[model samples]
Target: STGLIKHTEYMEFLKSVPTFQSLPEEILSKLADVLEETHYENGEYIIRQGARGDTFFIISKGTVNVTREDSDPVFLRTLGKGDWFGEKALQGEDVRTANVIAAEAVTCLVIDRDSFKHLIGGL
Candidate 1:
């Protein structure tokens, strides 16, 4: 079941994340258990800066704007398929690190607080 079709699509998202390091199979499986798909429309603030963040996200479709809550807020970058964010707070940061807005209609996989804590190493 681990390498089967049900996991293929989601696993592609998992495998696509930018990696600076490697993760364990145990952590990988735990992460699979936690992922749930979500969709956002263009211009929507999917996550706001300063909010108590209880979720992490991996963009599976379309693009999004990554911006800081700056005096001169500007687009930091655009994230598309396989790109991920929000892991910082999922480990229990008091608030979100930045605002994530949908640059276009987007699809993502979300991991909530406790589930994220179960496999923080998956990030």
Candidate 2:
């Protein structure tokens, strides 16, 4: 499945994330076991406002643009390799605040709601 990303590679990726930097090796290993990897082509919609969010993402490569639907899509943020987004969705807020689109082809790690809650609960 596309979810089965390599553990060692995932650990290396996690190490680059500021939020996960302080995480213990055991936690990282657990994360490696639970997280899934997904790929998106350029201009793909990762998240759309008003839709329910079920996962969070960590960008392993490429960029994602955060924008809204109504006004002109302003690039609120641009994530490069090792950056993460959609975490706020895990806090029980089903609605997405903005739209996230791939500014370029992207590789991202995805964690579903259950896994996200488990990880956050451990922290």
Candidate 3:
């Protein structure tokens, strides 16, 4: 089964993301429809520092560790439900600035460049 998420579920969740607060209803609706539901296992790396990125991720389940390098990596903080990351992937040079790892099993709503341009370019 595809296990598709309901459109309303995405709508409600997106409203809580600080970054999406100012977005208009039209864009948000399209964004919700285009997003991909992705999963990551415990101890998995969601984004590695200095890597090129083209997708934005919104955490919908579990938590993630935000870490940065200091020769060896150092943990910076924890991001839980409704948190988001990888904005740079969509808005800037498309390079990741930190390591985001699944502190446990994680689920994310993902959007790629193709969807972003079509849905978010108006803003």
Report the number of the highest-lDDT candidate. Answer: 3
Candidate 3, residue 32: lDDT: 80
What are the per-residue Cα lDDT tens digits for candidate 3 across 15-121?
Answer: 88877868888878877878878999999999999999998889999999999997689989999898889977777567788999999999999987767877756
**TM-scores for every predicted model:** 0.76, 0.86, 0.84
Best by the TM-score measure: 2
Q: How many residue pairs clash in each candidate?
A: 0, 0, 0
lDDT of 3: 0.86
Q: Give the better candidate number (1 or 3) by TM-score.
A: 3
lDDT per residue (tens digit) for residues 57-117 in model 2: 9999899888885646665777788888888777785889899899989999999888878
Candidate 3, residue 9: how far the Cα is off, in Å: 1.4
For all candidates in order, the CA lDDT equals 0.77, 0.85, 0.86
Candidate 2, residue 55: how far the Cα is off, in Å: 0.6
What RMSD value applies to candidate 3? 2.4
Which residue pairs does candidate 1 place in steric collision?
none
Range of the 10 consecutive residues with the lowest summed lDDT in candidate 1: 18-27
Query: What lDDT would candidate 1 get against the real structure?
Result: 0.77
